Amino acid sequence: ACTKNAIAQTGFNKDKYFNGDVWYVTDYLNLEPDDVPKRYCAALAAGTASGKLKEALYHYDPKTQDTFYDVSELQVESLGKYTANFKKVDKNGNVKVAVTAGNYYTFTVMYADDSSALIHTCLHKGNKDLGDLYAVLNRNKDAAAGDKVKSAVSAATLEFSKFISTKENNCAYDNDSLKSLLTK
Ligand code: HEM
Ligand SMILES: O=N[O-]
């Protein structure tokens, strides 16, 4: 289960974050042991469509090849803090698993600037018992974490040395599909 009430960035700029562009996960920290594979890759696009906040997600396991996409409409809890019902889709936006109650994640943007972000997410999926996940994001694939986001990790009282890097995994990203999915 999740245990953290993540605090959103003071002065979070939603229009800049939800601009339709892609964010790559470069480093992550799951608070629950063995909750996720130690080698993994993920990216998301965040944008608006008809005034609705949307995210499209991409997960890729570089070992098993398990690959999936999701689309979510985000509902606002407060500035920088959202609740998202996800539907699993193929890369084209075709629905594979419909939205259902109890299938949702929370999403909190703890820090963001032009090129980087620190987020917290808590995933709820059926009767699975999942824990908190922090992720360092960058606009550039596999970019080393800069001083601003690393300082934000510290300011959140987290130890960046504990984060697991995705940068060394052989991962490819379909950034074009992520951007197109925002409308789906
Ligand atoms: C490298 C970072 C991440 C890792 C290692 C990771 C790991 C995983 C794993 C292992 C699953 C499968 C869970 C299951 O089916 O039992 C999963 C599903 C999921 N994750 Fe992540 N994740 C990451 C980043 C993210 C982010 C940033 C978000 C939200 C912004 C997210 C949202 C979701 C959602 C919505 C599902 C379920 C999708 C579906 O079943 O259709 N993940 N993740
Ligand atoms: O571990 N996916 O939120």
Q: How far is the CA of 14 from the centre of ligand 1 (A)?
A: 22
* Nearest protein CA to atom 29 of ligand 1, as residue: 121
Contact 23, 41 (CB under 8 A): no
* Nearest protein CA to atom 2 of ligand 2, as residue: 123
Beta carbons within 10 angstroms of residue 120's beta carbon = 24
Pocket test for ligand 1, best of 25, 29, 133, 178 (most atoms within 8 A of CB): 133
59 is in an annotated binding site: yes
- Residues 138-163 as b/e (b if ≥16 CB within 10 A, e otherwise) read beebbeebeeebbebbeebebebeeb
**Ligand (nearest to CA of 128):** 1
The span from the CA of 69 to the CA of 86, in Å, is 10
Q: How far is the CA of 17 from the centre of ligand 1 (A)?
A: 20
Q: How far is the CA of 155 from the centre of ligand 2 (A)?
A: 23
The span from the CA of 22 to the CA of 174, in Å, is 10
Token representation of residue 123: 């995933």
Token representation of residue 26: 């470069």
- Residues 57-90 as b/e (b if ≥16 CB within 10 A, e otherwise) read bbbbbbeeeeeebbbbbbeeeeebbbbbbbbebe
Token representation of residue 80: 């920088």
Identity of the residue numbered 165: S
**Ligand (nearest to CA of 98):** 1
What is the experimental resolution, given in Å to one decimal place? Answer: 1.5
- Domains of the chain by start residue, with CATH: 1-184 (2.40.128.20)
Q: Which atom of ligand 2 is nearest to the CA of 59?
A: 2
Q: How far is the CA of 90 from the centre of ligand 2 (A)?
A: 18
Q: Is 103 in the pocket of ligand 2 (CB under 6 A)?
A: no
- Identify how the structure was determined: X-ray
The span from the CA of 145 to the CA of 129, in Å, is 30
Q: Which atom of ligand 1 is nearest to the CA of 72?
A: 35
Residue where the block lists tokens 């699993």: 88
